[PDB]
Amino acid sequence: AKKIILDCDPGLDDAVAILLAHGNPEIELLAITTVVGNQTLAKVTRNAQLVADIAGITGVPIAAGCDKPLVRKIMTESGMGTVAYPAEFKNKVDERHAVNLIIDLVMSHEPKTITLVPTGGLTNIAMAARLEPRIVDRVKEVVLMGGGYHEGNATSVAEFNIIIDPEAAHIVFNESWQVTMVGLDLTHQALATPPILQRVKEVDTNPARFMLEIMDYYTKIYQSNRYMAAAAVHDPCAVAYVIDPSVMTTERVPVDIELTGKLTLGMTVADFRNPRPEHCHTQVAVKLDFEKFWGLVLDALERIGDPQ
Amino acid sequence: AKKIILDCDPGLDDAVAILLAHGNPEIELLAITTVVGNQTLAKVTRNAQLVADIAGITGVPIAAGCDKPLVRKIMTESGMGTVAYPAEFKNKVDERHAVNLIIDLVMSHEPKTITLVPTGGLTNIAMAARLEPRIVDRVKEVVLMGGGYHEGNATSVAEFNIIIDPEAAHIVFNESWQVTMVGLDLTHQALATPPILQRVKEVDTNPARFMLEIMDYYTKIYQSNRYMAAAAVHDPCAVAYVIDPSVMTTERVPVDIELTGKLTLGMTVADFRNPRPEHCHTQVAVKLDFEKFWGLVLDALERIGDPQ
Amino acid sequence: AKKIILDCDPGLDDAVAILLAHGNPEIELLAITTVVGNQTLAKVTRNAQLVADIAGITGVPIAAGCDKPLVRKIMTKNKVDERHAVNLIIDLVMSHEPKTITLVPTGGLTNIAMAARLEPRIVDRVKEVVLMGGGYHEGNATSVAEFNIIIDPEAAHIVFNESWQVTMVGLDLTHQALATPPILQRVKEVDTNPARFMLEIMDYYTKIYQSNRYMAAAAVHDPCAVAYVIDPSVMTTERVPVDIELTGKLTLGMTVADFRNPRPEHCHTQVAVKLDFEKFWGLVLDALERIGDPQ
Amino acid sequence: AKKIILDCDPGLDDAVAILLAHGNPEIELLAITTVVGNQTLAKVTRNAQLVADIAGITGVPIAAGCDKPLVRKIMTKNKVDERHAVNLIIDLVMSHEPKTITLVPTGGLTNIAMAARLEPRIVDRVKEVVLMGGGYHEGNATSVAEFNIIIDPEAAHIVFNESWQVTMVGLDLTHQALATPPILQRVKEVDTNPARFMLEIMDYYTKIYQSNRYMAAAAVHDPCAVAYVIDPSVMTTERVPVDIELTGKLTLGMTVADFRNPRPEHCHTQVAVKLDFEKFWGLVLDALERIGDPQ
Ligand SMILES: [K+]
Ligand SMILES: [K+]
Ligand SMILES: [K+]
Ligand SMILES: [K+]
């Protein structure tokens, strides 16, 4: 079965993550919920709509959530890359706010059956926990793509999804549900190598082309500032985890969030020190199983086929 | 008319505030919403129920809101003082969460017609703004009892309602609605002097006795640590303001909230310095009109009469 | 009698405080120390030399102390002892009997702090500390902080946290020390080059500041610190606890005082409140007369 | 040749670092400075005197520096120059040619910081700074911070922010410097009271720490700093920017390094990574031999 709710801010990675989730047979996408990111909530939502349509997704609500972080200010493109949007989408946005939507699903289903998988800022997730504390013990677990125990990108020590809303992050990590942090340390191992891209080209389906198109567009921009032999895809990793834990190793360690540091704001602070606790609701992802991971993505694509 | 929503955490002051609001003919109480305080959300809510019943209030929802602050931990009695609760209340709690309730009222009414009057931590108010940004331009204004520009109590520089949830406070003060801060600087002038208490005793109504009972109980505890000739009542002041601005002087000054200080956490930072801006959505209360203020309370009592 | 060590970052008010220090009989000026202020240490030292000459002061060593705050980046005739203010300070205190000197800082506390940490024995020989810094319900560098504290918050934290007796002559008081027209008169009619040197300075930096807007009158600050020394009776004080904010984003460098009431009996800090305009001004004036004309 | 000034807070590792400093031919030990550490300055000085005797060291001045961190509250035969480490330090640097000494701090940076602020001319005479402090992906005092940094964060901030060349021999490296059984052998077979004095100390503080749990082996830290001096080749280093966290609640005192990649060409800081166990240990050992038996 494996029922989830994908909370994301569709830029390249979220799209793959949506594709994988939609395409993998062990996942049941209950919803796609959206959150402000490096692009506005409105833009990110269209993007999600765009993907939904490409992948041929149906009967899965896409709800927009929070347009700004809890407390911090964000204080700072045509379609998605070179892909134009149709004048109108097939898939529309619900009117329930992602937050309100997440609480109902959770509360309307059996306990410990839904996994939350956030791939952007933690704001909706945080709001929902604070708004309906009951959802924290119902949820099966929280598997998120974010943070980095020994690696940063937004900064020397910090990861985007976290620095974006450190309080929401603080809320989420300190609630009691079980939390799996799939951070930069793992994700950086997820390289779309030439052989992989080739394999993708071989699938020859609209969605596969679309994927490569957006990969190409973003990769260039990225691998254009400096040099990346290859770019890594992050978000899908979280989903891959729910499909099959064994796809990476994890470590049980306490992780909390820095809200006050000048240099270390948003750092996901991990304590791998001498006595490791007996009871810890947090864990970090360490090693990726490359072949299995990319097998999963390729599989999802083959199954999606050419919808429409 | 004067439609409001009273967001409070009923301990002594909130009760008077509810009495005044219910009893004054220029106020239309749309709702009583509850928030975690120095007592748990559950306890505070009963207290509100208790008052509602004493005052003979009807058709005004009492909704419970947030049970903890946004990010901080609170990390720390029989009826209400000597007053016992009945086995069951006449007034029940809605099921809409205060937050959800505040958004509907606001959104279901004409723009700029509802005044928010928070008398406890700002958590519900903050949650609702973040959850439905639209409510910020609809609301007439926000008149809150909290803060202190030159006076603290929770600490040397800080006031309870603010130190309790500094982020919620930060959210509220930084949103764009018009905000009137009725802080310790004003409130401390609101003394229940012997003559006043006498005047209250002269009203001779159940609600008046009840008031004195709770006044007495809390006053003793308070005026028992050290010496208060008289205790001041805070919360009602906010309400008095909406009934009639002229009851106190205010000053337009920018006010923001300290979230990082070691000594100054939660301080409502006010800038009364050399060029005062031309456009400022914040203002502070400075001088109380004692006679008019206590006249208002005495009036409300006379009008409430003896309900039931 | 009073022995002091006026620590400062000469510019308008320091200058005056210096004059009043010198020209007042009950003040014995062991030394004039220098600290980086709005201006570069160098400039502040020259300045201090200028004024010294101007006041016809001799036998008072003029030492330059620190040129950058402890941790923060500033970010925006008579000679100079080779002594670094800090060492000079230490000796003077080690070199005299206990509780006889009073430290009179009128810039940031960076020499004072350094000195307390280098030789700790001085906080308990020092008679008491009297600074012109802070504001308990007033700010200038910010809504809440004052120029002297915020420049070197750590330093200030240190000083305020030492066990010695500190008297904070903050903005709350100092904003009473007005330079009003009538005053500009009796000063004018003293006719000493210093008296003039006063108004010259009073005015230049009188306007500028009044210039942005409309400080109907100006106020001196630095002197008030001396004033109190000379005659504690000159202004009122409340003994309240005081500490320095180092981490607030809005409140950095705020002199935080607790006036809440239960009041402790054992308080080593206190704050200036009400000033006796008259007494104050006289003092200043007498001193100007007394200096006469520096041969 | 190498002239250094081993700044330290003697306890187990300092002790060794001292031995290796003395007993190594290429090291010329201008002085031994002392700084408050886990122990009181006093105790740390005595200790240093003990060891000095023990090593049969003479002509090396032993000065006590600061007894409390700059701002934070700690909170929980051979004689002592009357020189305060800080002054002593300043002279030595002012008293010799440019770029000839290397500062080797192995406690908190509070004397180094103070000294940089008192006489600024030293950051540009000093050859380079080599400290045993920090951790870039490792912590001991906390998940992320190391004992030497967190003790005096400001001080460390200062040092790391000065323009001089800093080499941080942090936990990442130092946790390689293991005291393994075989090692405990060749040491045992040196048969000098110092050699013994080593294991005596090695063991007492060997167990204790291994005692809480199970440091199969122990590691020395302080020495590694010396080691590098003696032969930079002894361990690898990466030139990355490094700064000190002063305000994080979880991250205070963290040595924050940026390994992100675009890498600047003009970096004055660098970090220790891989150690040559062998080369390291030899060094230590040779030094023990060379000391022979302190007459
Ligand atoms: K994302
Ligand atoms: K209240
Ligand atoms: K000054
Ligand atoms: K050490």
Coordinates of N, CA and C in Angstrom, one line a residue, chain B residues 92-192:
Chain B
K92 N -21.4 25.5 26.3 CA -20.4 24.5 25.8 C -19.4 25.2 24.9
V93 N -18.3 24.4 24.6 CA -17.3 24.8 23.7 C -17.6 24.4 22.3
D94 N -17.3 25.2 21.3 CA -17.6 24.9 19.9 C -16.6 23.8 19.5
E95 N -16.7 23.2 18.3 CA -15.6 22.3 17.9 C -14.7 23.0 17.0
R96 N -15.1 24.1 16.4 CA -14.2 24.8 15.5 C -13.1 25.3 16.5
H97 N -11.8 25.2 16.0 CA -10.7 25.6 16.7 C -10.7 27.1 16.6
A98 N -10.4 27.8 17.7 CA -10.4 29.2 17.8 C -9.9 29.8 16.4
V99 N -8.8 29.2 16.0 CA -8.1 29.7 14.8 C -9.0 29.6 13.6
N100 N -9.6 28.5 13.4 CA -10.5 28.3 12.3 C -11.7 29.2 12.5
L101 N -12.2 29.3 13.7 CA -13.3 30.1 14.0 C -13.1 31.6 13.7
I102 N -11.9 32.1 14.1 CA -11.6 33.5 13.8 C -11.5 33.9 12.3
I103 N -10.9 33.0 11.5 CA -10.9 33.2 10.1 C -12.3 33.3 9.5
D104 N -13.3 32.4 9.9 CA -14.6 32.4 9.3 C -15.3 33.7 9.6
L105 N -15.3 34.1 10.9 CA -16.1 35.2 11.3 C -15.5 36.4 10.4
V106 N -14.2 36.5 10.4 CA -13.6 37.6 9.7 C -14.0 37.6 8.3
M107 N -13.8 36.5 7.6 CA -14.1 36.3 6.2 C -15.6 36.2 5.9
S108 N -16.5 36.0 6.9 CA -17.9 36.0 6.6 C -18.5 37.3 6.8
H109 N -17.8 38.3 7.3 CA -18.3 39.6 7.6 C -17.8 40.7 6.6
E110 N -18.3 41.9 6.7 CA -17.8 42.9 5.9 C -16.4 43.4 6.3
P111 N -15.7 43.9 5.4 CA -14.3 44.3 5.7 C -14.2 45.4 6.7
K112 N -13.1 45.4 7.4 CA -12.9 46.5 8.4 C -14.1 46.7 9.4
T113 N -14.7 45.6 9.8 CA -15.8 45.7 10.8 C -15.5 45.0 12.1
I114 N -14.5 44.0 12.1 CA -14.2 43.3 13.3 C -12.9 43.7 13.9
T115 N -12.9 44.0 15.2 CA -11.8 44.3 16.0 C -11.3 43.1 16.8
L116 N -10.1 42.7 16.7 CA -9.5 41.6 17.4 C -9.0 42.3 18.7
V117 N -9.3 41.6 19.8 CA -8.8 42.1 21.1 C -8.2 40.9 21.9
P118 N -6.9 40.7 21.8 CA -6.3 39.6 22.4 C -5.8 40.1 23.8
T119 N -6.1 39.3 24.8 CA -5.7 39.6 26.2 C -4.7 38.6 26.8
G120 N -4.3 37.6 26.0 CA -3.3 36.6 26.5 C -2.2 36.5 25.4
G121 N -1.5 35.4 25.3 CA -0.4 35.1 24.3 C -1.0 35.3 22.9
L122 N -0.2 35.7 22.0 CA -0.7 36.0 20.6 C -0.8 34.8 19.7
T123 N -0.5 33.6 20.1 CA -0.6 32.4 19.3 C -1.7 32.1 18.4
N124 N -2.9 32.4 18.8 CA -4.1 32.1 17.9 C -4.1 33.1 16.8
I125 N -3.9 34.4 17.3 CA -3.9 35.5 16.4 C -2.8 35.3 15.3
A126 N -1.6 34.9 15.8 CA -0.5 34.6 14.8 C -0.9 33.5 13.9
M127 N -1.3 32.4 14.4 CA -1.7 31.2 13.5 C -2.7 31.6 12.4
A128 N -3.7 32.3 12.8 CA -4.7 32.7 11.8 C -4.3 33.7 10.7
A129 N -3.3 34.6 11.1 CA -2.7 35.5 10.1 C -1.9 34.7 9.1
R130 N -1.2 33.7 9.6 CA -0.3 32.9 8.8 C -1.2 32.0 8.0
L131 N -2.3 31.5 8.5 CA -3.1 30.5 7.8 C -4.1 31.2 6.8
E132 N -4.4 32.4 7.0 CA -5.3 33.0 6.1 C -4.9 34.5 6.0
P133 N -3.8 34.8 5.4 CA -3.3 36.1 5.1 C -4.3 37.1 4.7
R134 N -5.4 36.5 4.2 CA -6.4 37.5 3.8 C -7.1 38.2 5.0
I135 N -7.1 37.6 6.1 CA -7.7 38.2 7.3 C -7.0 39.5 7.8
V136 N -5.7 39.6 7.4 CA -5.0 40.8 7.8 C -5.5 42.2 7.3
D137 N -6.0 42.2 6.1 CA -6.5 43.5 5.5 C -8.1 43.7 5.8
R138 N -8.8 42.6 6.2 CA -10.2 42.6 6.5 C -10.5 43.2 7.8
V139 N -9.7 42.7 8.8 CA -9.8 43.2 10.2 C -9.8 44.7 10.3
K140 N -10.7 45.3 11.1 CA -10.7 46.7 11.4 C -9.3 47.1 12.0
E141 N -9.0 46.5 13.1 CA -7.7 46.8 13.8 C -7.5 45.8 14.9
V142 N -6.3 45.8 15.5 CA -6.0 44.9 16.6 C -5.6 45.7 17.8
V143 N -6.4 45.5 18.9 CA -6.2 46.2 20.1 C -5.8 45.2 21.2
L144 N -4.6 45.1 21.6 CA -4.2 44.1 22.5 C -3.7 44.6 23.8
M145 N -3.9 43.8 24.9 CA -3.4 44.1 26.2 C -2.1 43.2 26.3
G146 N -1.0 43.9 26.3 CA 0.3 43.2 26.4 C 1.4 44.1 26.2
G147 N 2.6 43.6 26.5 CA 3.8 44.4 26.3 C 4.0 45.5 27.4
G148 N 4.9 46.4 27.1 CA 5.3 47.5 28.1 C 6.5 48.1 27.5
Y149 N 6.4 49.4 27.1 CA 7.6 50.0 26.5 C 8.6 50.4 27.5
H150 N 8.3 50.7 28.8 CA 9.2 51.1 29.8 C 9.0 50.3 31.1
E151 N 8.4 49.2 31.0 CA 8.0 48.4 32.2 C 7.9 46.9 31.9
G152 N 8.4 46.0 32.7 CA 8.3 44.6 32.5 C 7.7 43.9 33.8
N153 N 7.3 42.7 33.7 CA 6.8 42.0 34.9 C 7.3 40.5 34.9
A154 N 7.0 39.9 33.7 CA 7.5 38.5 33.6 C 9.0 38.7 33.8
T155 N 9.6 39.8 33.4 CA 11.0 40.1 33.7 C 11.2 41.6 33.8
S156 N 12.5 42.0 33.9 CA 12.8 43.4 34.0 C 12.2 44.3 32.9
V157 N 12.2 43.8 31.7 CA 11.8 44.5 30.5 C 10.6 43.9 29.8
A158 N 10.2 42.7 30.2 CA 9.1 42.0 29.5 C 7.8 41.7 30.2
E159 N 6.8 41.7 29.4 CA 5.4 41.4 29.8 C 5.0 40.0 29.4
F160 N 4.3 39.3 30.4 CA 3.8 37.9 30.2 C 3.3 37.5 28.8
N161 N 2.2 38.2 28.4 CA 1.6 37.9 27.2 C 2.6 37.8 26.0
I162 N 3.6 38.6 26.1 CA 4.6 38.6 25.1 C 5.7 37.6 25.2
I163 N 6.3 37.6 26.4 CA 7.4 36.6 26.6 C 6.8 35.2 26.4
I164 N 5.5 35.0 26.6 CA 5.0 33.7 26.5 C 5.1 33.1 25.0
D165 N 4.9 33.9 24.0 CA 5.1 33.5 22.6 C 5.6 34.7 21.8
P166 N 6.9 34.8 21.8 CA 7.5 36.0 21.2 C 7.4 35.9 19.7
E167 N 7.4 34.7 19.2 CA 7.2 34.6 17.7 C 5.8 35.0 17.3
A168 N 4.8 34.5 18.0 CA 3.5 34.8 17.7 C 3.4 36.4 17.8
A169 N 4.1 36.9 18.8 CA 4.1 38.4 19.0 C 4.8 39.1 17.8
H170 N 5.9 38.5 17.4 CA 6.6 39.0 16.3 C 5.8 39.0 15.0
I171 N 5.0 37.9 14.8 CA 4.2 37.8 13.6 C 3.1 38.9 13.7
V172 N 2.4 39.0 14.8 CA 1.3 40.0 14.9 C 1.7 41.4 14.8
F173 N 2.8 41.8 15.4 CA 3.3 43.2 15.3 C 3.9 43.6 14.0
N174 N 4.4 42.6 13.2 CA 4.9 42.8 11.9 C 3.9 42.7 10.8
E175 N 2.8 42.1 11.1 CA 1.8 42.1 10.0 C 1.4 43.6 9.8
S176 N 0.7 43.9 8.8 CA 0.4 45.3 8.5 C -0.9 46.0 9.1
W177 N -1.8 45.2 9.7 CA -2.9 45.8 10.3 C -2.5 46.8 11.3
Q178 N -3.5 47.6 11.8 CA -3.2 48.7 12.7 C -3.3 48.0 14.1
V179 N -2.2 48.3 14.9 CA -2.0 47.7 16.2 C -1.9 48.6 17.3
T180 N -2.7 48.5 18.4 CA -2.7 49.3 19.5 C -2.2 48.4 20.7
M181 N -1.1 48.8 21.2 CA -0.5 48.1 22.3 C -0.9 48.8 23.6
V182 N -1.7 48.0 24.4 CA -2.2 48.6 25.7 C -1.3 47.8 26.8
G183 N -0.2 48.3 27.1 CA 0.8 47.6 28.0 C 0.8 48.0 29.4
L184 N 1.8 47.5 30.1 CA 2.0 47.7 31.5 C 2.0 49.2 31.9
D185 N 2.6 50.0 31.0 CA 2.7 51.4 31.2 C 1.3 52.0 31.4
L186 N 0.3 51.6 30.7 CA -1.0 52.1 30.9 C -1.7 51.4 32.0
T187 N -1.7 50.1 31.9 CA -2.5 49.2 32.8 C -2.2 49.4 34.2
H188 N -1.0 49.7 34.5 CA -0.6 49.8 35.9 C -1.4 51.0 36.6
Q189 N -1.9 51.9 35.7 CA -2.7 53.0 36.3 C -4.1 52.6 36.7
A190 N -4.5 51.4 36.2 CA -5.9 50.9 36.5 C -6.1 50.2 37.8
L191 N -6.0 51.0 38.9 CA -6.2 50.5 40.2 C -7.6 50.3 40.8
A192 N -7.8 49.1 41.3 CA -9.1 48.9 41.9 C -8.9 49.5 43.3

